[PDB]
Amino acid sequence: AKSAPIFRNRVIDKKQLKKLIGWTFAHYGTAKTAVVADDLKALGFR
Amino acid sequence: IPPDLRPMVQLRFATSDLNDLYRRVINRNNRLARLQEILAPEIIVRNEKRMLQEAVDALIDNGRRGRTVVGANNRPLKSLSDIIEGKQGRFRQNLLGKRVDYSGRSVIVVGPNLKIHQCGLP
Amino acid sequence: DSQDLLFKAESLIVNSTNRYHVTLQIARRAKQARYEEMEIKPVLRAILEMSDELN
Numbered sequence A: 001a002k003s004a005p006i007f008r009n010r011v012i013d014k015k016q017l018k019k020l021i022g023w024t025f026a027h028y029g030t031a032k033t034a035v036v037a038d039d040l041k042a043l044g045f046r
Numbered sequence B: 001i002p003p004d005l006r007p008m009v010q011l012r013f014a015t016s017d018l019n020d021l022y023r024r025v026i027n028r029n030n031r032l033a034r035l036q037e038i039l040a041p042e043i044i045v046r047n048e049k050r051m052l053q054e055a056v057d058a059l060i061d062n063g064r065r066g067r068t069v070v071g072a073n074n075r076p077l078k079s080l081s082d083i084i085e086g087k088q089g090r091f092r093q094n095l096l097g098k099r100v101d102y103s104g105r106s107v108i109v110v111g112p113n114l115k116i117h118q119c120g121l122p
Numbered sequence C: 001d002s003q004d005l006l007f008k009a010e011s012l013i014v015n016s017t018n019r020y021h022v023t024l025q026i027a028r029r030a031k032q033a034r035y036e037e038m039e040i041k042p043v044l045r046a047i048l049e050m051s052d053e054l055n
Helices: A014-028 A030-045 B017-037 B042-060 B090-095 C002-013 C019-038 C042-053
Strands: B008-010 B013-015
Touching: A014 A030, A030 C002, B013 B017, B017 B042, C002 C019, C002 C042, C019 C042
Parallel strands: none
Antiparallel strands: B008 B013
């Protein structure tokens, strides 16, 4: 925790998503990484 | 080998190849004993001994040394060595991998509303 | 909720330094739980208890 996310003001391809997931795992844990992945999946599908 | 490891079940009777191999061994052994009891000509006794050796060979490992003992159809009989070797052998078919209980199998479709730790089971 | 259990699980996996040892402890605890309860599911209650004990 305690690591505030950076405002990614750019286009988001697969590389950016993989980088974001890795950062989230490194800073937040494995269940917040799971939550983030589910939220991104929902947003992308919508 | 114990009889339940070479089952002779009734569907017709389905028999393991070990029964036929063992019968060959027993038949040749009994004939050899009879020949040794009646003082048969030496060539006949020697040929029977050769036959007994070949029958025991086919029992231990069919086709390793001589010709392969085929069955009713022209297929090799599965001897003792053929049981414990190969991808269909005992080790790889029943000891390192088994068919298990409490198992199912079905086609998979995509569940988009499920969570990553969940699955949809019919 | 399921999410709550997942967070508590992750919480216990860390600070244990051995995922195997802490899985064994959870199994044992849940076993005792159900045993002294037959007199929620065991593994779940076990994880809840162990998380609440980690303060």
